[PDB]
Design a protein around this ligand. Structure first.
Ligand SMILES: [C-]#[N+][C@@H](Cc1ccc(O)cc1)C(=O)O
Ligand SMILES: [Mn+2]
Length: 259
């Protein structure tokens, strides 16, 4: 009745999953149990397992065990390759569907790289830590985002607070500004600047944010319905190479914010 992997809880949220014996293969892990843990804990770091997922064919075949892949024009896999931070967002903003899971495989992460950790914000925890007056204000705010050339048109109008697709709580949908692109609704224009200051401070809080330093062959599973994610600005030059696959909910979740 024991698990077939070791688990350690991450601060402030998430699970770090590691092998029980040397050279344990990633294919040994029970995918349906992992999906349940990812929905409950929002972030899984699978570290130390043997895999050949830098092979695009093998990675795609592996991800199909998790569900329907959300395909992009370039295919199933985005190869993320290498100063400013990348703003918090959720994936699928400008697409017709929002994927439930992001899978990141680390094909390359030199110790040579300094900083630039991937950021993960548990918006369920943000909602749970808010006062009632805060949450009431946030539920009344909606935001229009304008982006780059995209395949499906490029304007997003999203409430700041949404109910989770599983109807078991509320989440935050927010795209932080980068250093009009963003336009806030239902708030006095006189208060927008300070609200933006205050809300970004709330998201970049040690109670809510986990910053991940990559190691080669990490497989990270992200609950895109519950989290926002981004990246710290890089101090040094980096050769990091991540490989990203999106997995649809069943049925796929249509993106009502796309305009
Ligand atoms: C569609 N879409 C994107 C969403 C996005 C929006 C803003 C930003 O800075 C980065 C990514 C994805 O899911 O990849
Ligand atoms: Mn992203």
């Amino acid at each position: 009745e024991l698990n077939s992997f070791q688990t350690e809880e991450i601060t402030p949220f998430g699970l770090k999953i590691t092998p029980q014996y040397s050279d344990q293969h990633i294919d040994t892990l029970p995918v349906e149990q992992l999906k349940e843990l990812a929905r409950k804990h929002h972030l899984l770091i699978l570290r130390g397992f043997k895999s050949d997922l830098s092979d695009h064919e093998k990675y795609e075949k592996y991800a199909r065990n998790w569900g329907e892949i959300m395909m992009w024009p370039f295919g199933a896999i985005l190869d993320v390759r290498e100063n400013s931070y990348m703003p918090l967002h959720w994936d699928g903003m400008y697409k017709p569907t929002i994927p439930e899971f992001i899978m990141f495989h680390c094909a390359h992460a030199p110790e040579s790289d300094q900083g630039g950790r991937t950021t993960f914000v548990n918006t369920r925890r943000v909602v749970a830590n808010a006062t009632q007056q805060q949450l009431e204000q946030w539920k009344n705010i909606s935001i229009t985002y304008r982006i780059k050339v995209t395949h499906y048109g490029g304007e997003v109008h999203s409430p700041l607070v949404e109910e989770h697709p599983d109807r078991n709580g509320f989440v935050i949908r927010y795209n932080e500004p980068a250093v009009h692109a963003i336009e806030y609704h239902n708030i006095n224009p006189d208060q927008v600047a300070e609200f933006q200051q205050d809300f970004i401070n709330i998201l970049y809080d040690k109670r809510h944010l986990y910053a991940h330093a990559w190691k080669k062959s990490d497989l990270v599973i992200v609950d895109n319905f519950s989290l926002l994610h981004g990246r710290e600005g890089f101090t040094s030059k980096s050769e990091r190479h991540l490989q990203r696959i999106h997995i649809q909910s069943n049925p796929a979740f249509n993106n009502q914010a796309l305009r």
